[PDB]
Ligand binder design. Structure first.
Ligand SMILES: O=C1CC[C@H](N2Cc3cc(Nc4noc5ccccc45)ccc3C2=O)C(=O)N1
Ligand SMILES: [Zn+2]
Lengths: 289, 778, 372
């Protein structure tokens, strides 16, 4: 019998560690992230700290309660919908061009909001983008801020120094430079988002089925397989704009702010060219019709 | 605490009168009941001969004569309001007169709801039983035997729960009455079995009667049966027999009293709510309008065309009827008039003539019996008739006149408008004025009368707005203004609205016979009260208590407000202290904080009981009148160590007055001492009483003297003096505290010298000096 | 309109029919008594009110057991502050329905109590077991005779027995005819008349419920006044004041004042965010517009029903469990500014039901407001 915070009974595990919980005062369902005290890789106290900063922007989930219960650190938060990786699987590993372009728009803005509050996500992958529930079922939430790093001071806006020699995460969507041990900035979030888009466009990436015994070996193929494949090759047979986006991100200087209006315009104009409406009818909405 | 209350003028209203043979089998008597007072008269050819006047320790709620078998003369049954019952007898031996108690007891039930149509006492024609309807659903029967000296009684269950009127009919003791139910109103009969202790089926079937039946009349033999009187009809039900009549002469007003002229029930006297006097005269039934008397509470034919009219609202009359002498019409002529100060709905004390001895001027009576009365020290009363109802009165020395609010009834017109019913003081002024405005149904019209203090003529009459109701009157100076003004606070009253949402405070001035509206301020509710407060005007508008300043622009400017829990019906003020009240005894104390310009509640006391008036005795004491005719005193302790005690008012005086007070008044009627202070009050029966404070020493002394006096003085009906004066409501009865019955102390001067010695047995002449000093206060 | 008003008062959601008692316990008025206090209860219990309960902790279950054997009555404290643990007044609750259940091995007891008698707290004492017993003084119930019965002319007593706008005008002119002898008008005596006050309140209840006034509504002013007191969505400091009142004439009078002055119902935490208005209040239960209900884990919510709310955001999706109003579902509702919980939204389940959507608001999250 696990009631967290005085009010949240944990019904079941809905992710792994994300748990459905129910508030015993009202009946409201919430999500509870359980992290062991004296765990190997502690982040919950960090995430609870970032969520206080990011509170207020659209697509950022509300925190109910952080604290300790029994042996654990507890994060009680909004219950969201499926992830984009969940919904990809629902659609049989295939998104239309409309669903990518619509998803491109919200995804760009989510990453932008975090960038404004002075942090880089460093974990841009479909698993961390989630639709909401109920009134928020067309809204996209960017979550899991365990890997989020400050990149500039809040008042002086001075950027973090250029380093090399850091450890990359999810190799699949990392940037070229972040494999090369170069320190990450806003550009590397943008370049990441772009791989996520192409991975919707083609059922897989050119560096996806590269197997090797150890994780160091898994990364090494992918990192140089990516360096081997031109952005034109990767986006071939898809609209020019996708290649223009990736060329832009990798065109950025370390400290240099991305032009979010330009990146959102590329797909918004393309969305217009393809004679689509932004009617929040995604591929998955059709399968439920 | 420890106050002394004493009667200044006994009650004058007549709430009942009977005729019979009570002092002698040969004499004809007129017995009059004035609340606590019983008056006995011998009916001579000349007039009425006063024979004996007794006081009772109770409010006479029933008074009937009856002559059982074996008695030489009638006996008198009396039931007081507190349910003391009794039978009395007149015994005289030479010069000594005594009212001896033949039987007595209290008939109250531990459980029961007081009936809607009131107490009803009836006595069987054969003197077999006394029937009482004290509570709904029960009929109490006291059996008339020699061996019932305790007046023991049993109840019979009464299915008809809404009984209007009931009389014993003229073989078995039969009652006929009228009940009200969804079906309608009906007339029914029951026999009463003393042996069975229940009801049996009555002689004649239940008949469906008029939906306004309010009065039952038992016709004696040879006619028998009963007469049921309603708003439109007068029917005669005697078993099977029926003779209904619906005369238009009676349709105008409801008939409220009746009297059997002829012993065989041939002709009856009828009187309505408006003073008309009728004659009711079995094959045929008919009515005749005889003339106009005072509004009758009770009628009683005496002999040789003379009648006594007892008047609760107005003055009591002996009138001569000329029913015979058929050359001239039936006409009523007033032989004698007896003063009735009641109801006193307001009064004031003015030093009119002697400039040392105060004079009491009241608003008294209602409707056509409305009048002023000027009372000065055996009391002397001068009756200024008004033919409409006075409601407030105040004096204005500067303009040597009185300001009086009043009200008259007018009926809606066919033309669109209203027509008065008779001339009245507001319509016969020498100068008049009306406020600037913005079917047959009664409409109430309110005026400000201006009245010469010397002649008592109606110099000016100002009429107020349509549907405006005048509530408060003041005479005073305000601000830096040398002028003195009449200020009337009003309320707009429409039948659809339930609480007053508009009102006015109107500043008049009386100069050179001309009354002018100096200023008018409109407020958002009823102005229940106003008082002059240290050069400002303190006006209560519903639950707000507001303070006004008189600008040099001759305007009222709001200085502060104070919103209370309660509606501010009563206002009073001593110093910077204010006493706020409401109809439910909710007392409040405020104090004006001049350094802050606002009000600050000092204390309160909420004990739910209906409250009729309040008055500031001293800085620490407040005197009130509260439900079931009681007086009380509340007290403040500004010294107390805790703030929970210092904002609490302690109940320090409880007294069963026996009268319904309407106004308290600081002042005296004597030439301006063991007593401190003087509060005069007036009541619904027209009683005037005097309230004044004592010392703990003088209180304790008189208190011992009361108990002794109670051991020696013979109470008519053997009613205990402690029981009578005990604080009374239907829920609680507590013994009286903090009050000295000055009417009992003063009765010492009337007890016999041997009895005086018995009381003084710790010197009787030493006590007579104390009592005589105490008679010098009124 | 198309859902049984009787289903919510049955409290069928609690489960199978409970054991019912028929007896009654009433301490004689003004009597000092010590009565135990259920530790977790926070409600300010008006008399004549049903309080559902589900007790889980072992100390609570034991305490109900003793009561079902003794006089069955516990003390419900009206708290000035809960954390202060201070209370000046409260009400006796008599248990009249119970059921014991052994769920997942743990003993559980479900109770329906009813408020009986107002009291003044003389002393509170927590015993060595953690359960606290209350020194209490039973506050009497004030009944006043008619206003003018005393000043009634015995001859004029006839006016009293009396036969809608034309009827109340004749009622006021006859029952209050003897105001001619007193200094106050007849219409002011009707501002203190129980039957006149109640008929003014019945006019406001019919605006909330289509139910005929005749049967549902009690004739006795004391029972009528307490029934109305229970269904007013006011705040606790007001209700503690209303409880302090002993006279129905005043209780009925402070009730009409509240129903006319306060027209807006705003979030208590914001004080300024408007949630709904008295125009939207409506009765979907027999006991009135507002009733007391228990959540599966024992929390008890006083749930006022309104057709329309605003400034509420829904959280989650409709659920059909524990539906205090069966045939309806619920979506937890938060205040749009402070995110405090305000109540639940009820959404029908069969299209034939009416109303198809309604709202249920928990009194403790509201604040009655006077406009301007
Ligand atoms: O009509 C209404 C409005 C809503 C209101 N509810 C319903 C409810 C259910 C609940 N369920 C559960 N908590 O933990 C659980 C673990 C497993 C399975 C179920 C649960 C917790 C609280 C409440 C509450 O407040 C009510 O009782 N009635
Ligand atoms: Zn809020």
């Amino acid at each position: 019998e696990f009631i967290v915070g005085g009010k949240y009974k944990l019904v079941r595990k809905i992710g792994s560690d994300i748990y459905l919980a129910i508030n015993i005062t009202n009946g409201e369902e919430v999500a509870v992230k359980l992290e062991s005290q004296k765990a190997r890789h502690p982040q919950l106290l960090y995430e609870s700290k970032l969520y206080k900063i990011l509170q207020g922007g659209v697509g950022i989930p509300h925190i109910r309660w952080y604290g300790q219960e029994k042996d654990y650190n507890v994060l009680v938060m909004d219950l969201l919908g499926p992830s984009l990786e969940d919904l990809f699987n629902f659609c049989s590993r295939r998104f239309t061009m409309k669903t990518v372009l619509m998803l491109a728009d919200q995804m760009i803005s989510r990453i932008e909001y975090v960038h404004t509050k002075n942090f880089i996500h460093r974990d841009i992958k479909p698993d961390n983008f989630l639709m909401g529930i109920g009134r928020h079922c067309n809204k996209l939430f960017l979550i899991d801020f365990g890997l989020a790093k400050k990149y500039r001071d809040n008042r002086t806006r001075q950027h973090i120094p250029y380093r090399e020699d850091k450890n990359l995460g999810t190799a699949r969507y990392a940037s070229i430079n972040a494999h090369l041990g170069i320190e990450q900035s806003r550009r590397d979030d943008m370049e990441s988002l772009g791989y996520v888009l192409m991975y919707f466009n083609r059922t897989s990436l050119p560096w996806q089925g590269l197997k090797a015994a150890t994780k160091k070996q898994k990364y090494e193929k992918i990192s140089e397989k990516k360096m081997s494949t031109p952005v034109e090759v990767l986006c071939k047979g898809f609209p020019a704009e996708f290649a223009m986006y990736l060329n832009y991100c990798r065109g950025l200087r370390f400290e240099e702010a991305p032009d979010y209006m330009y990146l959102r315009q590329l797909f918004r104009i393309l969305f217009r060219t393809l004679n689509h409406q932004y009617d929040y009818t995604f591929d998955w909405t059709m399968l439920k019709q | 605490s420890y106050n002394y209350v004493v009667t200044a003028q006994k009650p004058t209203a007549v709430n009942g009168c009977v005729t019979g043979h009570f002092t002698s089998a040969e004499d004809l008597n007129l017995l009059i009941a004035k609340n606590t007072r019983l008056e006995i008269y011998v009916v001579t050819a000349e007039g009425l001969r006063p024979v004996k006047e007794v006081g009772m320790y109770g409010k006479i709620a029933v008074m009937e004569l009856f002559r059982p078998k074996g008695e030489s003369k009638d006996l008198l049954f009396i039931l007081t309001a507190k349910y003391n019952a009794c039978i009395l007898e007149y015994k005289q031996s030479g010069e000594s007169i005594d009212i001896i108690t033949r039987a007595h007891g209290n008939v109250q039930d531990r459980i029961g709801r007081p009936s809607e149509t009131g107490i009803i006492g009836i006595i069987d024609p054969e003197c077999r039983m006394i029937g009482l309807r004290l509570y709904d659903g029960l009929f109490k029967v006291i059996p008339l035997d020699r061996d019932n000296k305790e007046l023991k009684a049993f109840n019979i269950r009464l299915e008809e729960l809404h009984v209007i009127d009931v009389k014993f009919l003229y073989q078995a003791p039969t009652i006929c009455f009228v009940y009200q139910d969804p079906q309608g109103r009906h007339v029914k009969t029951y026999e009463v079995s003393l042996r069975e202790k229940e009801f049996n089926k009555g002689p004649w079937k239940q008949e469906n009667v008029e939906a306004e039946a309010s009065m039952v009349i038992a016709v004696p033999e040879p006619f028998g049966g009963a007469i049921i009187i309603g708003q439109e009809s007068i029917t005669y039900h005697n078993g099977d027999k029926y003779l209904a009549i619906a005369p238009p002469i009676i349709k105008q007003s409801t008939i409220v009293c009746h009297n059997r002229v002829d012993p065989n029930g041939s002709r009856y006297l009828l009187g309505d709510m408006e003073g008309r006097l009728f004659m009711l005269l079995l094959k045929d039934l008919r009515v005749e309008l005889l003339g106009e008397t005072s509004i009758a509470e009770c009628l009683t034919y005496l002999d040789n065309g003379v009648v006594f009219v007892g008047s609760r609202l107005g003055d009591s009359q002996l009138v001569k009827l000329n029913v015979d002498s058929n050359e001239q019409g039936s006409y009523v002529v007033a032989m004698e008039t007896f003063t009735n100060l009641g109801p006193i709905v307001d009064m004031c004390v003015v030093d009119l003539e002697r400039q040392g001895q105060g004079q009491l001027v009241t608003c008294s009576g209602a409707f056509k019996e409305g009048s002023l009365r000027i009372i000065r020290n055996k009391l002397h009363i001068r009756t200024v008739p008004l033919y409409e109802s006075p409601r407030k009165i105040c004096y204005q020395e500067v303009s040597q006149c009185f300001g009086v609010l009043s009200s008259r009834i007018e009926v809606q017109d066919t033309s669109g408008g209203t027509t008065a019913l008779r001339p009245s003081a507001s319509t016969q002024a020498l100068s008049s004025s009306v406020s600037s405005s913005k079917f047959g149904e009664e409409v109430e019209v309110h005026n400000l009368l201006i009245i010469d203090q010397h002649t008592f003529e109606v110099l000016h009459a100002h009429q107020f707005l349509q549907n405006e109701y005048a509530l408060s009157l003041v005479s005073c100076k305000l601000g830096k203004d040398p002028n003195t003004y009449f200020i009337v606070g009003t309320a707009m009253v429409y039948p659809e609205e339930a609480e007053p949402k508009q009102g006015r405070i109107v500043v008049f001035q009386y100069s050179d016979g001309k009354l002018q509206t100096v200023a008018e301020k409109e407020v958002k509710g009823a102005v229940y009260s106003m008082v002059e407060f240290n050069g400002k005007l303190l006006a209560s508008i519903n639950s707000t208590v507001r303070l006004y300043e008189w600008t040099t622009e001759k305007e009222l400017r709001t200085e502060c407000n104070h919103y209370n829990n309660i509606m501010a019906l009563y206002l009073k003020t001593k110093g910077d202290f204010i006493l706020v009240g409401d109809l439910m005894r909710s007392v409040l104390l405020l104090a004006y904080k001049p350094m802050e310009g606002n009000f600050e509640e000092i204390a309160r006391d909420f004990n739910p009981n209906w409250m009729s008036a309040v008055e500031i005795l001293d800085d620490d004491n407040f005197l009130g009148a509260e439900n079931a005719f009681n007086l009380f005193v509340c007290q403040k302790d500004s010294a107390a160590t805790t703030d929970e005690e210092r904002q609490h008012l302690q109940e320090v005086g409880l007294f069963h007055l026996g009268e319904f007070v309407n106004v308290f008044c600081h002042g005296s009627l004597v030439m301006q001492t063991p007593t401190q202070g003087s509060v005069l009050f007036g009541t619904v029966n027209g009683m005037i009483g005097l309230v004044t404070s004592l010392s703990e020493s003088w209180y304790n002394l008189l208190l011992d003297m009361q108990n002794r006096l109670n051991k020696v003085i013979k109470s008519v009906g053997k009613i205990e003096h402690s029981f009578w004066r005990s604080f009374h409501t239907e829920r609680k009865t507590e013994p009286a505290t903090g009050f000295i019955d000055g009417d009992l102390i003063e009765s010492f001067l009337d007890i016999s010298r041997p009895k005086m010695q018995e009381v003084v047995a710790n010197t009787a002449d030493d006590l007579i000096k104390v009592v005589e000093e105490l008679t010098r206060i009124h | 309109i198309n859902f049984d008003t009787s289903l919510p008062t049955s409290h069928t959601y609690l489960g199978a029919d409970m054991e019912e008692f028929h007896g009654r316990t009433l301490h004689d008025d003004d009597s000092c008594q010590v009565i135990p206090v259920l530790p977790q209860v926070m409600m300010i219990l008006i008399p004549g009110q049903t309080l559902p309960l589900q007790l889980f902790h072992p100390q609570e279950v034991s305490m109900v057991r003793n009561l079902i054997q003794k006089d069955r009555t516990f003390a419900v404290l009206a708290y000035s502050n809960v954390q202060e643990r201070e209370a000046q007044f409260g009400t006796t609750a008599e248990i009249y329905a119970y059921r014991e259940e052994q769920d997942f091995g743990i003993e559980i007891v479900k109770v329906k109590a009813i408020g009986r008698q107002r009291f003044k707290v003389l002393e509170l004492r927590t015993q060595s077991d953690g359960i606290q017993q209350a020194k209490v003084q039973i506050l009497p119930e004030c009944v006043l005779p008619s206003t003018m019965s005393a000043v009634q002319l015995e001859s004029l007593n006839k006016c009293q027995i009396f036969p809608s706008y034309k009827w109340w005008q004749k009622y006021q002119k006859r029952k209050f005819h003897c105001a001619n002898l007193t200094s106050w008008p007849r219409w002011l005596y009707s501002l203190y008349d129980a039957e006149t006050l109640m008929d003014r309140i019945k006019k406001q209840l019919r605006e909330w419920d289509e139910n005929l006034k005749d049967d549902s509504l009690p004739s006795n002013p004391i029972d009528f006044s307490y029934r109305v007191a229970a269904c007013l969505p006011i705040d606790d400091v007001l209700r503690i004041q209303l409880l302090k009142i002993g006279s129905a004439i005043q209780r009925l009078r402070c009730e009409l004042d509240i129903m006319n002055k306060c027209t807006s119902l705003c979030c208590k935490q914001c004080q300024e965010t408007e949630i709904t208005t008295k125009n939207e209040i409506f009765s979907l239960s027999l006991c009135g517009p507002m009733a007391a209900y228990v959540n599966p884990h024992g929390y008890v919510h006083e749930t006022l029903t309104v057709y329309k709310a605003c400034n509420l955001n829904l959280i989650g999706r409709p659920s059909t469990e524990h539906s205090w109003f069966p045939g309806y579902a619920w979506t937890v509702a938060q205040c749009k500014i402070c995110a405090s919980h305000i109540g639940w939204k009820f959404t029908a389940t069969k299209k034939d039901m009416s109303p198809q959507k309604f709202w249920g608001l928990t009194r403790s999250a509201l604040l009655p407001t006077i406009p301007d």
